[PDB]
Amino acid sequence: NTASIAQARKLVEQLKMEANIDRIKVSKAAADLMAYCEAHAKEDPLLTPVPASENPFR
Amino acid sequence: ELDQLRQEAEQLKNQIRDARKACADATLSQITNNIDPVGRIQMRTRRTLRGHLAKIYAMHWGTDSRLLVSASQDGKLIIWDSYTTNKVHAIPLRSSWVMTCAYAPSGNYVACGGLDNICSIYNLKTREGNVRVSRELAGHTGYLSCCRFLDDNQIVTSSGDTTCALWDIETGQQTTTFTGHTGDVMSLSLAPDTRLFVSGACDASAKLWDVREGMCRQTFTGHESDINAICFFPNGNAFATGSDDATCRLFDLRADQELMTYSHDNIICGITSVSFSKSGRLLLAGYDDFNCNVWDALKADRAGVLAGHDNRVSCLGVTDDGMAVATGSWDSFLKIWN
Amino acid sequence: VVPLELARGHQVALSSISYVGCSLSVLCLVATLVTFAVLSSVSTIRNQRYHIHANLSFAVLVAQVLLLISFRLEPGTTPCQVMAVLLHYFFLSAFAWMLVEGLHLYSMVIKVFGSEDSKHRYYYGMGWGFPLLICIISLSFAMDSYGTSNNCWLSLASGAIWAFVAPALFVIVVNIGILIAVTRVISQISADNSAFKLTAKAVAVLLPILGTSWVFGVLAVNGCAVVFQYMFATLNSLQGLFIFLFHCLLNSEVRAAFKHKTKVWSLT
Amino acid sequence: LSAEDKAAVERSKMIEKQLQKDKQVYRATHRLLLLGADNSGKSTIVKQSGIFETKFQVDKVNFHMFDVGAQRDERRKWIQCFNDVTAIIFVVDSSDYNRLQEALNDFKSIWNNRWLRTISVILFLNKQDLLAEKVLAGKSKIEDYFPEFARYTTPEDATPEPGEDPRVTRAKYFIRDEFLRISTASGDGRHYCYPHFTCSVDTENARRIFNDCRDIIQRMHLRQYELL
Ligand SMILES: C[C@]12CCC(=O)C[C@@H]1CC[C@@H]1[C@@H]2CC[C@]2(C)[C@@H](O)CC[C@@H]12
Structure with a gap:
């Protein structure tokens, strides 16, 4: 019916929109994750154990 | 026509997969090995809350890292404080089965839902009187799964009608429907930026959704099972998904391809909940094997086991400041770890 | 009544068997108590029945240890009379606790609708207190009948035996009735289908925890007591061994809880 | 715990x-x-928009029945929450000779659920007053649908209603045997089935549910005490 053709057009224009997502090297994302995990490490009281003085669950 | 559509829906998928493959040249496991491992973790529970009646499904941390909520089959919603193991309010409601909890950024509104197909919000900070109903939401012919607040005025949610919907408290009208999913949708998470959000379905697929224009932004590869829970990196460029295939994977937004495979020979039970830490180095997954597991998100190496639960775990969350983790299981027990 | 316990051909092989049975019972009962105490965090050991089991095991343990100490004690000295009072009080408490267990079983089987009602206070008030009341009414009038020239126990020819034999008979007849009803129910259920196996296992399990082996005492005191004292001494005694072997090593719930606890311990 | 948290x-x-x-x-x-x-049956049984709930009192015992009217055909992804119910009431039309195999298939699917191998199922029946006039007149004989009608003899254990020809009792026990045949293949754990025969305008349903629940609880308690 008309609904089937409408869904076909919708998926066509969705897939066409999927064809341009300015694909970039994944190594940049890995380097960004590296920098974020390295710089933002001191203020995480889960990986680095914290003394009981600065702990509110004592 | 139909045959032309089927024929055209093949080379486009082939070219999309080729573009995805061409972007990848080295996964995460090949670049994170010179960093020293986290090491053994001996985290133990500091206090047990044990204030519930039956199996629980949902939990959510507050904005100030002090209050949290939970729901059970008893039909009672209780606002819960961890500093002094006390409680503030107890909320009874019509439907005895609810599987959704949500705490607004501002400590004012709390939303609950289930298979009753009615979404009800509650005004905690009432003007003059006790806490009562504020506004009901209807329009979905399927069971609600989960909802997450976006602002104090608007709210997004997912239901069993294989579609997602966002609702405005004013006029209570479905502004923009989210269609394009075949199977039921049973997971939904938001992002620090109030413009993008993703959801997972039971057809082994996840979709990137835009709040404003209501147009699906990105598709995702298969997961070989039905997605149970999802989360989002605080950075806003990645997220982790779970399923019943006893595996967890991390998908980054920019690349749109899985980079991490979390699989162990011993584990065969499925995943139930997934959450991240503050820094982004550790993520916790609530396993079906009567316990919870930690995972060094930067590599493939278990870093300890948070055993101590006598029943299946359902919900698990991490506070905003990233200094505590809470888990909930079907034995009506709440366990929080330092 | 004339005791007629042992005159010429049954004295021997009686005290040694008592020693061996008491030692085995005390070892198995301390093991059972340790297992019960350790496996208390699990939610499956939370109902009222395990509380009854723990209290009954503790009472039997303390009674057996007290009797073992009583055997090695001179007669006609104040500690002997004090510990004899304690002896009969503890035995009465154990009998009352088995009666409470029988009542709980009757409520659980015949009257399934209403089993869970949180009757902790009533169960404790029926278990303890009642032996204390019996002890105080007995000692208000009968005090000289708490020591014998043979050895310091409750005397036989004085006539103050009523504090033990009458509650024993009451518990025994109640247990017999409850066991008959439960066996009839289980035979009616099993008829809808190995006939001997189910009933035999049920009676074997229910025998040395509900107190149905004490009927032999009445026949031993009066009757042809030449081949029954052996059974009376070699059965009632090994109560700890029987209760251990039947409700700690063979129960389905405790094995799973122990496996889960071992897995948790080995995990971290 | 200063003078603020009191x-x-x-x-x-x-x-x-x-x-x-x-x-x-x-x-x-x-x-x-x-x-x-x-x-x-549905409405007729309940006579005495997400989900509906009704309550009845029998022999001073509270009961809680539940039903759905908006869920899709896919019955999974929500049956998991129903893991603590006492029993599952199952209703079958059984008057019309068609649309019967699908009922058996979904009954088998529910029975063979991996997560539901603890709850028993009570097999109910309805439209008895419609079966009689459809079997005494030969226009839609059940032999055509099920060719194994010739090889059937009424079971020795029977409670036939007075003034009933052997064909109607044969059909009733035919339906009962066909329903119970799949049940005995699996199970042998802590749950059994329970066929029943009630009319539509009767009032004995509560008594049968009461006695069935009593039997289920008795069996569960006997399992718990290890006596059984
Ligand atoms: C303690 C026993 C053994 C069984 C019981 O618990 C009480 C009963 C009291 C009489 C005792 C008997 C053991 C054997 C004894 C001690 C004989 O030596 C004479 C009296 C007997």
Whole structure:
């Protein structure tokens, strides 16, 4: 019916929109994750154990 | 026509997969090995809350890292404080089965839902009187799964009608429907930026959704099972998904391809909940094997086991400041770890 | 009544068997108590029945240890009379606790609708207190009948035996009735289908925890007591061994809880 | 615990008292799930928009029945929550000779659920007053649908209603045997089935559900005590 053709057009224009997502090297994302995990490490009281003085669950 | 559509829906998928493959040249496991491992973790529970009646499904941390909520089959919603193991309010409601909890950024509104197909919000900070109903939401012919607040005025949610919907408290009208999913949708998470959000379905697929224009932004590869829970990196460029295939994977937004495979020979039970830490180095997954597991998100190496639960775990969350983790299981027990 | 316990051909092989049975019972009962105490965090050991089991095991343990100490004690000295009072009080408490267990079983089987009602206070008030009341009414009038020239126990020819034999008979007849009803129910259920196996296992399990082996005492005191004292001494005694072997090593719930606890311990 | 949190602890105590009061009501009620397809009893059984709930009192025992009217055909992804019910009531039309195999297939699917191998199922029946006039007149004989009607003899254990020809009893026990044949292949654990025969305008349903629940609880308790 008309609904089937409408869904076909919708998926066509969705897939066409999927064809341009300015694909970039994944190594940049890995380097960004590296920098974020390295710089933002001191203020995480889960990986680095914290003394009981600065702990509110004592 | 139909045959032309089927024929055209093949080379486009082939070219999309080729573009995805061409972007990848080295996964995460090949670049994170010179960093020293986290090491053994001996985290133990500091206090047990044990204030519930039956199996629980949902939990959510507050904005100030002090209050949290939970729901059970008893039909009672209780606002819960961890500093002094006390409680503030107890909320009874019509439907005895609810599987959704949500705490607004501002400590004012709390939303609950289930298979009753009615979404009800509650005004905690009432003007003059006790806490009562504020506004009901209807329009979905399927069971609600989960909802997450976006602002104090608007709210997004997912239901069993294989579609997602966002609702405005004013006029209570479905502004923009989210269609394009075949199977039921049973997971939904938001992002620090109030413009993008993703959801997972039971057809082994996840979709990137835009709040404003209501147009699906990105598709995702298969997961070989039905997605149970999802989360989002605080950075806003990645997220982790779970399923019943006893595996967890991390998908980054920019690349749109899985980079991490979390699989162990011993584990065969499925995943139930997934959450991240503050820094982004550790993520916790609530396993079906009567316990919870930690995972060094930067590599493939278990870093300890948070055993101590006598029943299946359902919900698990991490506070905003990233200094505590809470888990909930079907034995009506709440366990929080330092 | 004339005791007629042992005159010429049954004295021997009686005290040694008592020693061996008491030692085995005390070892198995301390093991059972340790297992019960350790496996208390699990939610499956939370109902009222395990509380009854723990209290009954503790009472039997303390009674057996007290009797073992009583055997090695001179007669006609104040500690002997004090510990004899304690002896009969503890035995009465154990009998009352088995009666409470029988009542709980009757409520659980015949009257399934209403089993869970949180009757902790009533169960404790029926278990303890009642032996204390019996002890105080007995000692208000009968005090000289708490020591014998043979050895310091409750005397036989004085006539103050009523504090033990009458509650024993009451518990025994109640247990017999409850066991008959439960066996009839289980035979009616099993008829809808190995006939001997189910009933035999049920009676074997229910025998040395509900107190149905004490009927032999009445026949031993009066009757042809030449081949029954052996059974009376070699059965009632090994109560700890029987209760251990039947409700700690063979129960389905405790094995799973122990496996889960071992897995948790080995995990971290 | 300075002189500020003294109100919070007493408020928590009040909440604990309210929860303890609610505990008795919650524990003194049995929950039942009612399954079934269209053209079944449904409204007639309930006569005495997400989900519907009705309650009845029989022999001073509280009961809680549940049903759905908006869920899609896919029955999974929500059956998991129903893991603590006492029993599952199953209703079958059985009047019309068609649309019967699908009922058996979904009954087998429910019975063979991996996560549901603890709950028993009560097999109900309806439209007895419609079966009689459709079997005494030969226009839609069940032999055509099921060729194994010739090889059937009425079971020795029977409770035939007075003034009934052998064909109607044969058909009733035919339906019962066909329904119970799949049940005995699996199971042998802690749950059994329970066929029944009730009319549509009767009032004996509550008694049968009461006795069936009593039997189920008795069997569960005997399992718990290891005696069985
Ligand atoms: C303690 C026993 C053994 C069984 C019981 O618990 C009480 C009963 C009291 C009489 C005792 C008997 C053991 C054997 C004894 C001690 C004989 O030596 C004479 C009296 C007997």
